[PDB]
Structures are given as C-alpha cells and as structure tokens.
Amino acid sequence: LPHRRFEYKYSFKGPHLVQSDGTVPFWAHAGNAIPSSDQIRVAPSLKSQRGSVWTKTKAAFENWEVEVTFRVTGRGRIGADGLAIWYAENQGLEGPVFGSADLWNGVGIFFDSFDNDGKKNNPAIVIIGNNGQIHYDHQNDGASQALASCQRDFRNKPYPVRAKITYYQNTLTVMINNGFTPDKNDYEFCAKVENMIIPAQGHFGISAATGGLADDHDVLSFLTFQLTE
Numbered sequence: 746l747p748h749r750r751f752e753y754k755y756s757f758k759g760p761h762l763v764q765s766d767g768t769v770p771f772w773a774h775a776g777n778a779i780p781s782s783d784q785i786r787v788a789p790s791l792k793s794q795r796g797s798v799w800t801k802t803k804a805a806f807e808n809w810e811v812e813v814t815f816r817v818t819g820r821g822r823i824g825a826d827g828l829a830i831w832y833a834e835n836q837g838l839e840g841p842v843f844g845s846a847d848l849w850n851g852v853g854i855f856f857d858s859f860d861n862d863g864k865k866n867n868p869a870i871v872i873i874g875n876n877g878q879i880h881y882d883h884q885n886d887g888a889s890q891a892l893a894s895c896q897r898d899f900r901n902k903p904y905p906v907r908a909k910i911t912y913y914q915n916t917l918t919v920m921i922n923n924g925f926t927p928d929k930n931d932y933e934f935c936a937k938v939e940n941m942i943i944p945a946q947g948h949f950g951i952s953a954a955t956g957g958l959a960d961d962h963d964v965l966s967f968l969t970f971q972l973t974e
C-alpha cells in the first residue's frame with residue numbers, strides 16, 4: 746500500500762467550489778462549463794456543448810491518484826456524449842475530444858455515453874494514451890486506439906459515480922464506484938494498463954461534450970493525491 750498525500754492545488758470541491766469572481770481556485774474553465782458552489786456543470790444538457798476545466802499549473806508526481814465524483818444525467822435511455830478525465834503535457838481547454846483539445850500528449854479516460862459505432866457496447870469507459878500524433882476517432886468511439894476498456898453504465902445513478910484513477914509504478918488503474926450506494930468507497934475494477942509511460946509534468950483536466958443528444962455532465966469534486974512507496 747502506497748502513501749497518499751492530498752494536493753489541494755490540483756483539486757476542487759464543494760461546498761464553496763466557486764469564488765465570488767466566478768473562478769474556481771487553481772483551475773481554469775473554458776467553453777460552456779458552469780462553476781457553482783456545489784459542483785461544476787462541464788457540459789449542460791443542450792445540443793452541441795463543449796466544456797472543460799483544467800489545472801492552471803503542471804504537476805510533477807512520479808506517482809499519483811485521482812478521485813473524481815461526477816453525475817451524468819439525461820432524460821433518454823440514450824445520452825451523449827460523455828466526460829473525459831485528463832493528464833496531459835498541455836492544457837486542452839477547447840477542442841473536439843469530449844470538449845477538449847485533440848492530439849494530446851498523455852492519457853485520456855473517456856466515459857463515452859454514445860455508441861457512435863453501433864456495436865451496442867456503450868456506455869463504456871475507455872483509456873486512450875497519446876503522444877500528440879493521434880487523431881481521436883469519435884465515430885468509432887476510439888475503439889481502434891483504446892489501450893483498455895470496460896462497459897459500465899454511469900448514466901442516471903441515484904448516487905454520484907466515483908472514478909478512482911491511479912498511476913503507480915508505471916501502472917494505470919481505473920476503479921469505478923457505479924453510484925448505487927451511499928458508500929463512497931465501494932469500488933469495482935474497470936480497466937488497467939501496465940508498464941505505461943506518461944509525461945513527467947502535466948495538467949489534470951475534466952471535459953464534457955454534447956451533440957444531437959445531450960446530458961448534463963456534472964463534477965462534484967476532483968481530488969488529487971501524490972503517491973509514494
């Protein structure tokens with residue numbers, strides 16, 4: 746078991762998430778994301794929305810863990826498009842990849858709500874690495890570019906869904922609390938990538954998008970911990 750050190754500079758949470766100036770401390774928000782005291786609505790349930798929130802400053806942790814609490818809520822059985830969790834060399838405040846910049850250097854964990862390839866494998870959670878030379882394949886839900894994935898339904902759960910994403914000793918693990926209980930700590934293994942290399946310094950990010958179909962994409966909290974052996 747590795748030691749965890751909470752890092753506030755790379756985190757945000759309620760109940761006073763937003764500053765009077767409408768800014769969230771230590772983070773930058775772009776597009777149509779709305780920051781409020783309880784939560785940030787990265788993408789609203791309106792057509793064609795892009796939202797992102799990124800850390801202002803880079804983090805340089807050999808090992809790290811991230812816990813994100815989010816709600817994806819939609820009227821339909823089918824919703825779009827999803828939310829992305831980022832660790833990349835540069836801020837991807839705006840762009841076509843779930844509200845963020847494409848051709849990133851780093852890893853994106855995509856919570857893809859919409860089955861763009863008609864394989865009936867969505868919603869899905871997809872880990873996609875990148876060195877800045879790959880154009881994300883939105884039409885194929887990046888099936889061809891995925892390092893790992895699991896099928897998990899994060900839409901319309903009674904409690905907030907929690908994602909625990911750990912980078913420790915070169916291994917990237919994603920644990921999911923699928924929001925069926927009031928226990929914060931009930932986690933189920935979703936996917937992992939072994940022996941994976943990512944940039945020494947990076948920005949943490951969360952982004953969401955909509956198209957023809959829209960869901961409200963909400964992040965209650967983003968928590969970052971440095972990890973040590």
Ligand SMILES: OC[C@H]1O[C@H](O)[C@@H](O)[C@@H](O)[C@@H]1O
Nearest residue numbers: 825826859861955956957958
């Ligand atoms: O929102 C779902 C779907 O809506 C439209 O069909 C397009 O904008 C797609 O890119 C998007 O995936």
Ligand SMILES: [Ca+2]
Nearest residue numbers: 857859861886
């Ligand atoms: Ca998709």
Ligand SMILES: [Ca+2]
Nearest residue numbers: 860862866886
């Ligand atoms: Ca699919």
